[PDB]
Amino acid sequence: GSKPNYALKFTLAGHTKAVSSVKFSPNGEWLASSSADKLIKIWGAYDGKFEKTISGHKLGISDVAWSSDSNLLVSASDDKTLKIWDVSSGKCLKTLKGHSNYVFCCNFNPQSNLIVSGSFDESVRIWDVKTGKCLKTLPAHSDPVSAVHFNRDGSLIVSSSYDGLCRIWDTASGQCLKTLIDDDNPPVSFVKFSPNGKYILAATLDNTLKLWDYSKGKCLKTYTGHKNEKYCIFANFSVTGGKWIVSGSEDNLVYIWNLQTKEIVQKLQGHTDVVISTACHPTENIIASAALENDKTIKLWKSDC
C-alpha cells in the first residue's frame, strides 16, 4: 500500500551497554551491531538468531560497517583505532592506528579497497584495506567528525561535524570539492549520500533532517516531527518498498517519512531509550533499530509495503 505497516517481529538482547550502530550485510544474511560494551555481535537478519561475538577493542565501539562482499567488517573505537575483521573467523585482520582521539564513524568504499574514518581529533583518514596503512589524513573539520560516507562510484567522500559544516572530498586527491552546509551552528550530526549519489541526507541537532542536491548545493526536502538535539542518530533511505526516510529519535521512537511528501507515515513504539541507529534491509521491507543504555536491545520490524 501507500504507507508502511512495520510491526515488531524480534527483540535481540545481549549487549551489556548502549548499542551504537546496526548495519545489515549487503547480501542480506546478517545484522552487525556495535556497542559501548567493546563488542560486535552478528545476528540472523530474518530470525534475529544470535550468531557470534567479535572481541578485541580495548574501549567502546561507536560504529561498524560491512565490505561490499559481506566478508569483512570495520569498527571505530574509543581506543583510537579501527579494526578490520574477518566475519567468518571472527579474527582481527588489521588494526588501523593514527587517529589521536576516539574514532567515531567509518565506512568502506564500494570497491572495498579503502576505509574512511572520522574522529574526535577533527580529521578524516583514508586507509588501505590490504595493508592497513593510512594513505591520507584530511584536516577536514574544526570539531569532532560525526559521519563519513562514500558515494556510489567511490570518487567522493561526504563528512559532517559539530563545527556545523558538511564537506565533500575528492577521494583520489583528498582535496575539498564543496562545503555544502556552511553554518557556525547547528552541529551536523549525520550525513550520507543517496543510493544514486545525487543527494545528501543531513541531520542537524535542531530536530531537523534535510535532503540536499549535491550538484546544485540546494535543500530539496526537510523532515521534522522527531527529537534530535544531542546524539548522532543515523538516517536511512528505505528503497525496497515505498520510498521512505527512516530515523531514530530521542523520544524513543523510529520515525518513517514519505521522501517526496515529507509527511510522517509511521512511528514505531517499543524502545525504552533513545533510538540511536536504524538500518534498512537491502532486499526485504525490514528495519533494525537499536537503543541506548536504559534499553540495550535491537528490534527487527517488518512491513508488507
Ligand X SMILES: C=CC(=O)NCCCCc1nc(CO)c[nH]1
* Contact positions with ligand X (CB under 6 A) in 86-105: 104-105
Query: Binding to ligand X by residue 228, rule CB under 6 A?
Result: no
Span from 108-116, 220-228, 229-237, 262-270 in contact with ligand X (CB under 6 A): 229-237
Report residue 116 as a C-alpha cell. 574512511
Query: Binding to ligand X by residue 231, rule CB under 6 A?
Result: yes
- How many other C-beta atoms lie within 10 A of the C-beta of residue 60? 18
Span from 127-135, 210-218, 231-239, 244-252 in contact with ligand X (CB under 6 A): 231-239
Query: Binding to ligand X by residue 190, rule CB under 6 A?
Result: yes
Rounded CA separation 91/154 (Å): 27
- Closest by Cα among 186, 176, 180, 165 to 220: 180
Minimum distance between the CB of residue 62 and ligand X, rounded to whole angstroms? Answer: 4
Rounded CA separation 218/101 (Å): 33
Task: Check residue 242 and report its DSSP letter.
Answer: S
DSSP-assigned beta bridge partners for residue 119: 103
Are 268 and 238 spatial neighbours (Cβ–Cβ below 8 Å)? no
Span from 168-176, 230-238, 279-287, 293-301 in contact with ligand X (CB under 6 A): 230-238
Minimum distance between the CB of residue 146 and ligand X, rounded to whole angstroms? Answer: 6
Query: Binding to ligand X by residue 193, rule CB under 6 A?
Result: no
* Contact positions with ligand X (CB under 6 A) in 261-300: 276
Minimum distance between the CB of residue 107 and ligand X, rounded to whole angstroms? Answer: 9
Nearer to ligand X, 4 or 296 (CB): 296
CA dihedral in degrees (96, 297, 266, 218; nearest 10)? Answer: -20
Minimum distance between the CB of residue 295 and ligand X, rounded to whole angstroms? Answer: 13
Minimum distance between the CB of residue 299 and ligand X, rounded to whole angstroms? Answer: 17
Minimum distance between the CB of residue 231 and ligand X, rounded to whole angstroms? Answer: 4
Minimum distance between the CB of residue 247 and ligand X, rounded to whole angstroms? Answer: 11
Q: In the sheet where 50-54 sits, what is the strand order?
A: 19-24, 30-35, 40-44, 50-54
Rounded CA separation 20/177 (Å): 30
Query: Binding to ligand X by residue 146, rule CB under 6 A?
Result: yes
Looking at residue 305, its amino acid is: C
Are 274 and 291 spatial neighbours (Cβ–Cβ below 8 Å)? yes
Nearer to ligand X, 182 or 229 (CB): 229
User: Residue 176: helix, strand or coil by DSSP?
Assistant: strand
Q: Residue 139, preceding bond cis, omega within 30 degrees?
A: no
Q: Which residue of 74, 103, 147, 157 would you call a contact of ligand X, by CB under 6 A?
A: 147
Query: Binding to ligand X by residue 63, rule CB under 6 A?
Result: yes
| Contacts with ligand X, residue ranges (CB under 6 A) | 20-21, 62-63, 104-105, 146-147, 190, 231-232, 234, 276
